[PDB]
Design a protein around this ligand. Structure first.
Ligand SMILES: *[C@@H]1O[C@H](CO)[C@@H](O[C@@H]2O[C@H](CO)[C@@H](O)[C@H](O)[C@H]2NC(C)=O)[C@H](O)[C@H]1NC(C)=O
Length: 130
């Protein structure tokens, strides 16, 4: 499923993402946009370290979810990577909250660092009623 912008904003707000660890809904929207274009089926394989990023938040298989084929995986979210490919994003959000609880926080997402950080991101939520 490829979410509509305001549709996703309302969904994340309902799931407790607005202001989670001080992170605004607009920041979460900015990173979903650049990481996956709001697509829950998005997957990207890293030939280099042999790991895969899954879903709307592009969560990596080495540290967060288990896909069974990644060397040295940890599975900190205690989730099967397939759960991050569902149309329902509840599991994705719970895992995304777990990621930000680690030392580096939101800096774990390459896309936030390159396109969202120190940038005005209000345009991601304007007109959504959130
Ligand atoms: C993106 O990949 C990087 C590593 O390529 C992940 O960062 C690691 O995260 C673990 C767990 O917090 C840390 O112990 C490592 O020190 C981090 N490594 C580096 C180089 O920063 C990052 O968590 C992944 N992001 C997502 C969203 O899965």
């Amino acid at each position: 499923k490829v979410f509509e912008r305001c549709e996703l904003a309302r969904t994340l707000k309902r799931l407790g993402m607005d202001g989670y660890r001080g992170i605004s809904l607009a920041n979460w929207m900015c990173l979903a946009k650049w990481e996956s274009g709001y697509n829950t089926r998005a997957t990207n394989y890293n030939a280099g370290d042999r790991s895969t990023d899954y879903g709307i938040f592009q969560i990596n298989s080495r540290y967060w979810c288990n896909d069974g084929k990644t060397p040295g995986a940890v599975n900190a979210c205690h989730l099967s990577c397939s759960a991050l490919l569902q149309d329902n994003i509840a599991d994705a959000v719970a895992c995304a909250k777990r990621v930000v609880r680690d030392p580096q926080g939101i800096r774990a997402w390459v896309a936030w660092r390159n396109r969202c950080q120190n940038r005005d991101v209000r345009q991601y939520v304007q007109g959504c009623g959130v």
